[PDB]
Amino acid sequence: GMPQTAIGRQLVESGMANDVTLDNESVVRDGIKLNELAFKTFGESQHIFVATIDLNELTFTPATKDDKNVPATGPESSAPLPIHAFAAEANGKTVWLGVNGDYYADNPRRVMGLFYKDGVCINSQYFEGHDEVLYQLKNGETYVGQADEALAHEANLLHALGGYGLLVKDGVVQNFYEEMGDLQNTHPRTSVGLSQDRKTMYVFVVDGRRKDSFFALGLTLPHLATMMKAVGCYNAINLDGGGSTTLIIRKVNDGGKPTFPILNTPADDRVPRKVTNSMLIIEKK
């Protein structure tokens, strides 16, 4: 019976998943597969989504609440993930999938990692330790790496979305999280990685804090990293987690208008958190 999908088999083979009770897969659209699973990780219940995106067919962009390419200005700058999708859509993008983005500091509200969008620097002054990045060059090539590597491309850097925690590096699971404090405990997680050829993107949304009938605890970073390598990530990074972790997909309603339902269970007692940046999978134009 279980597991029944390739990803389910990969996660069980990795040692990070047992007692699989849900293992479903669907096609969001051509070029985007979505897998939803429930299982135990060393005795603790979990509930995760893994999206596999064909980067020959689709691309990504970092997103803000209003699709404007300027730093956050205040509380108005944060909104639940669907708002980011709607604003991108209203500004000529066709959005198919989204997750929350990078870590933010407060007082004043400001992004902690590197943040570039459409060739415009939103932040180049990444905080201590906030070194991880998913980036794209103007030539269309996508990479996962370190902030200085992205910056070294100068005016050829198109997009950059920051993270905190390098999970997989050149096919080897990483475990150098010791400066990250309580982020090392189990948590909901959002993470992103690339295949070795950089033509496939993997997005994980790991629910946590047992806010629905799955009783999903959440994961440590070595466990998540191990799962990501298992499904094909050669390079992978941890984005903002906890109550920030949110997944949307496009739903085309009769009449043609899109909505952007949230598929996971937000860990702030089921209430979608207002987030200041995000990662959207969009059509190539």
Residue numbers at the binding site for Cl ion (CB under 5 A):
71-72, 110-111
Residue nearer to Cl ion on the CB measure, 110 or 169: 110
Distance separating alpha carbons of residues 50 and 229, to the nearest angstrom: 12
User: CB nearest Cl ion: which residue?
Assistant: 71
Between β-strands 247-249 and 95-100, what pairing exists: parallel, antiparallel or unpaired?
Answer: antiparallel
Beta bridge partners of 37: 23, 48
Q: Residue 80 in contact with residue 275, Cβ under 8 Å?
A: yes
Contacts of 41 (CB under 8 A, 6+ apart): 16, 17, 18, 217, 219, 223
CB of 122 to Cl ion, least distance (A): 6
Q: Residue 222: helix, strand or coil by DSSP?
A: helix
Distance separating alpha carbons of residues 248 and 100, to the nearest angstrom: 9
CB of 260 to Cl ion, least distance (A): 23
CB of 49 to Cl ion, least distance (A): 27
CB of 184 to Cl ion, least distance (A): 26
Residue nearer to Cl ion on the CB measure, 233 or 279: 279
Distance separating alpha carbons of residues 236 and 203, to the nearest angstrom: 9
Distance separating alpha carbons of residues 264 and 48, to the nearest angstrom: 8
Residue nearer to Cl ion on the CB measure, 78 or 200: 78
Q: Which amino acid is at 269?
A: D
Residue nearer to Cl ion on the CB measure, 9 or 110: 110
Q: Which two tokens stand for residue 201?
A: 């993107």
Q: Residue 102 in contact with residue 163, Cβ under 8 Å?
A: yes
Residue nearer to Cl ion on the CB measure, 32 or 111: 111
CB of 125 to Cl ion, least distance (A): 10
Residue nearer to Cl ion on the CB measure, 121 or 262: 121
CB of 74 to Cl ion, least distance (A): 11
